[PDB]
Design a protein around this ligand. Structure first.
Ligand SMILES: *C(=O)[C@@H](NC(=O)Cc1ccccc1)[C@@H]1N[C@@H](C(=O)O)C(C)(C)S1
Ligand SMILES: *C(=O)[C@@H](NC(=O)Cc1ccccc1)[C@@H]1N[C@@H](C(=O)O)C(C)(C)S1
Lengths: 600, 601
């Protein structure tokens, strides 16, 4: 009975197998398996004939490492076999595990596992349990593990992992042995769109910065996995216009010129080399490259897995329901979820919160703010273009993300009030400094916290908590948990708990319209008039961000390197992150009526 | 509901607690405990959390919290011997930090990391307004304060209880304990208590004759020493002419008079002891950690000494192989090692009755004339105890005097391998039996339990029995789930796929009966106990590195052994009949008291 993960459309996406036990009748056990356990210890005092009687009591319960309880569960976990399918060597291997299922574990210690196994086989031969023909056959055998994957998460991997990883973080492994059915808030349609959007957008950035060379050279093809419609290939021959590579299935294909001609060499973030003139300039024989098919087959392409990363988090602003979550380029490349764990500087994406607080103090989008050099704090922050503009309205200041006005508004608003709003988005006391650096978006945030923060505009100034579980049922079918979220607007549940108000209705509604002005009048791609959004770029374009919404959906996208480096000069939030956001929102919001903030 | 260990005479001797879970109603949980789990993680996605509080109720009694603890109540019991409402804020925070990795943060395994995690949580609890700063300073300054109760109770017959736990765990792992079963052993409690006293007195006898070896420590702390085998650590505070004064672990100061320490002839070596002490300063120094023994009144104290020497006793029923008594060393609290089941030693002349039984097999009798003459085996001429020879002598005289030359001659007569096969058929390990003429003088390594199995062959009429310690196992519901089906030497004897297994015959009835009587005459001629149904053989290895005695009656086989764990000489006077035999006599006399004569048939 495994932990089962479903989407909001009651569709099964993941099964997570915990503690396994397959009880067998003593008669169903091959004698050689019993013999293996009898030879496992030198001395029995319960020859070993009374151990055979007491063995029946423990045979289905013995912990045999890696969630295996009993002989059948160990035959399944280690070899993907039934007890009668096991070899003498395999039976002896399992027979050696009870004493210490970690010091002898063939996964965690293959060295000692073989030593123990063969000792048992040696003892079985001495006891006349096995013949020498069986002894030589068995002792010469390798470990031969064929471990089936009991953690099935192949449909929406980041969504299934989110459930497993979060339950384990808060409650340990016992959370997976409960056999519960977890019914998530995830929209599968929206989840699929987000997965494609993050993959395409990162492939877009990667392609424009050029070919970086093969992912490895003189390394073994067995050590690389296929994913995101990219398949590892070992280059075998390089010609005038085409190369030949060996696939993991054993086949060899011929990647033609049109499939590699894009490979202008990467020189730096801001520089790429001339278009390649021959295939030798792109690949070397014994290079580990990634290839891509077409629809069915026909032709192949030389592709590249981005070194760059990204994320997407989409939440319902009224309750905080998580609709879509993508933690990186691909789950197989990295199981790391940047949406829930990727601490980054928000840069300019923080400004709408600070400018909302200015509006709360009495200001308007038209209020005159001053873009001037700020020496104050014996630290002089400089604007993006190293320029100043003088007196400009609050709305202009936000749109151009004038760093000097932000520090001035932070001095006006007070560092305390700013930190209070931030904590209301899920932030900890320890992750927001007191200093005037918070006006510039330098403190580390998780994108989920940004989606929570932007939801404040979308919902009219209420504090919603992001949540991924709608209900949990026990294996039987009984509902044991039913989500009771804090609602921004309780009447709105037509197309119990009330969320506390964190920002004044007018300020949340005003910021919303400034953000809509920012997207409709600044930048320029969708046929919607209910969208508000803000771009963000940190110092030396170390992060590209876009936080945007409509009345029914908040989406935050991010693009950057895991080890912080520049994305390039001409690489801002609106260039790297925005195209993923547009591509998601357009598709996710397709055939849905206009929904905007309610000034109540 | 722990693994319970009983004797054959129905005494509960040990309780072994495995996986623990004490389910509690969510309402019964102190809010500070819930708050601790709330502050344990930075972000929850299932200031306030709320979502976690609802999902916590589902796992609160099942969360694995390390060291067999499942749920908050089990962790409160295991780590602190407290109920959840008795926990401090610091303790609640400690348990709250364990779910994520109950080993990387375990306070019993990794205390440093555990302290860092706990305080981080307390810090987090203060930030959220869960705890006040007064509670924060109070809690953060607290130590680990572990008060782990002992869930493995075994203080009646410790070697017997440990035998069950250690053997189930060896063969079946920890899951063998969390089963809640009732194990009904073959152990006789009366006999077990006698054996415990016998092994303790006999080793104290050897130790005392060998002299005082000095205090167990000097200038060290009295808190670091345990009391056991009726010996209590004392720190010497004053040394008078004829007496000394020592501080006890309870805080009292006792006076040890001259008669209490006068035995303390100083130990020089196994073969040498110093002159009788003339004054108390020659025995003790002020600040010496000594061991004392009271009388029954606690009105007189004695200076005693824990033997450096070891011993064992194993008593089994020869008809089925039931283990009646087992003592693995001087005391379980000095060493948890069981020398009866794990102590591999050379048997010495304790092996000759096996070899002489095979001589009888082929056709010989106790009266058959054998040759005590000088025997050359390659570049090794074995010499008898006294180096002398006796010429033609009957087989029984040869065994009694343990004439090494007749043994090698009998080994040549029966054949090296045909003997190895028989030694194995007696219960000795194939790999542990060499392929040479020295197996005649007991060179192999044996377990005493194997010797008791082998001697039971004489006692039972030539059958091979297997030693067993479990009579039956019942589940928690009272249902018998296991019932021992041993191989019986004599099935009719109990009434004084099959229901009753008949043990395999390994000797002709005549040769087992003949060896038995040879062994009885070995014992009657130069033993003490008022019994005529006892047969036995002494054993001494080269340089008295081992003193042995293997003896029986029709109902009980007892094997005793005396020696050092790191093989050294016991001394020159120290043969099997001197060191081991007195423990055997002392046990057998008391164990067989008020029982009719029982001999082989
Ligand atoms: C907030 O993100 C702003 N960042 C900065 O002013 C610092 C900076 C920006 C680019 C390179 C080096 C340093 C603004 N981010 C973008 C944006 O909002 O899209 C601008 C390019 C307008 S600056
Ligand atoms: C068997 O134990 C025999 N021992 C030896 O040959 C070696 C030895 C060791 C110490 C002293 C003398 C000889 C013989 N049988 C034992 C016995 O049965 O007790 C003797 C010590 C008599 S010698």
């Amino acid at each position: 009975k495994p932990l089962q993960v479903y989407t909001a459309d009651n569709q099964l996406i993941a099964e997570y197998g915990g503690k396994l036990s397959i009880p067998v009748e003593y008669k169903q056990i091959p004698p050689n398996f019993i013999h293996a356990f009898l030879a496992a210890e030198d001395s029995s005092f319960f020859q070993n004939l009374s151990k055979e009687d007491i063995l029946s009591l423990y045979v289905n319960k013995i912990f045999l490492g890696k969630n295996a309880y009993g002989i059948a569960a160990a035959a399944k976990i280690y070899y993907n076999k039934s007890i009668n399918e096991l070899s003498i060597a395999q039976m002896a291997m399992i027979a050696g595990l009870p004493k210490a299922p970690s010091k002898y574990n063939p996964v965690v210690n293959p060295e000692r596992a073989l030593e123990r196994r063969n000792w048992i086989l040696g003892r079985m031969l001495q006891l006349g349990y096995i013949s020498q023909a069986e002894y030589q056959k068995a002792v010469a055998e390798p470990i031969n593990l064929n471990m089936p994957n009991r953690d099935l998460n192949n449909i929406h991997p980041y969504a299934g992992e989110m459930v497993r990883s979060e339950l384990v973080k808060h409650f340990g492994e016992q959370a997976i042995d409960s056999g519960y059915k977890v019914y998530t808030t995830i929209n599968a349609k929206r989840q699929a769109i987000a997965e494609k959007a993050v993959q395409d957008g990162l492939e877009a950035y990667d392609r424009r910065h050029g070919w970086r060379g093969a992912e490895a050279h003189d390394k073994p093809l067995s050590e690389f996995r296929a994913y995101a419609n990219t398949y590892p290939a070992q280059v075998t021959k390089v010609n005038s216009s085409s190369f030949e590579a060996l696939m993991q299935d054993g086949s060899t294909v011929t990647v033609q010129w049109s499939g590699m001609s894009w490979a202008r060499p990467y020189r730096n973030a801001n520089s790429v080399g001339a278009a390649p003139s021959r295939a030798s300039q792109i690949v070397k024989v014994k290079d580990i490259v990634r290839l891509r098919p077409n629809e069915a087959k026909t032709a192949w392409s030389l592709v590249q897995v981005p070194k760059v990363q990204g994320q997407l988090i989409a939440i319902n602003p009224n309750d905080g329901s998580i609709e879509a979550i993508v933690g990186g380029y691909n789950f197989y490349q990295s199981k790391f979820n940047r949406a829930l764990q990727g601490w980054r500087q928000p840069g300019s994406t923080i400004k709408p919160f600070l400018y909302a607080l200015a509006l709360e103090r009495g200001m308007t989008p038209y209020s005159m703010v001053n873009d001037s050099p700020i020496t104050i704090g014996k630290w002089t922050p400089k604007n993006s273009d190293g320029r100043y503009l003088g007196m400009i309205p609050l709305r202009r200041a936000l749109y151009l993300s004038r760093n000097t006005v932000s520090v001035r508004l932070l001095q006006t608003v007070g560092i305390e009030r700013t930190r209070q709003l931030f904590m209301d988005f899920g932030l900890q006391e320890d992750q927001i400094p007191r200093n005037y650096t918070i006006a510039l978006g330098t403190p580390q945030v998780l994108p989920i916290q940004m989606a929570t923060g932007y939801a404040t505009f979308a919902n009219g100034g209420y504090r919603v908590q992001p949540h991924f579980i709608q209900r949990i049922e026990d294996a039987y079918g009984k509902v044991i948990y039913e989500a009771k979220p804090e609602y921004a607007c309780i009447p709105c549940i037509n197309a119990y708990r009330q969320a506390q108000r964190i920002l004044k209705s007018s300020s949340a509604y005003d910021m919303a319209n400034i953000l809509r002005d920012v997207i409709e009048h600044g930048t320029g791609k969708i046929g919607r008039s209910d969208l508000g959004g803000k771009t963000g770029t940190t110092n030396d374009a170390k992060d590209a961000w876009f936080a945007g919404f409509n009345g029914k959906l908040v989406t935050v996208t991010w693009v950057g390197f895991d080890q912080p480096t520049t994305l390039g000069r001409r690489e801002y939030g609106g260039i790297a992150a925005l195209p993923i956001w547009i591509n998601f929102m357009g598709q996710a919001l397709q055939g849905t009526p206009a929904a905007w903030v309610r000034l109540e």
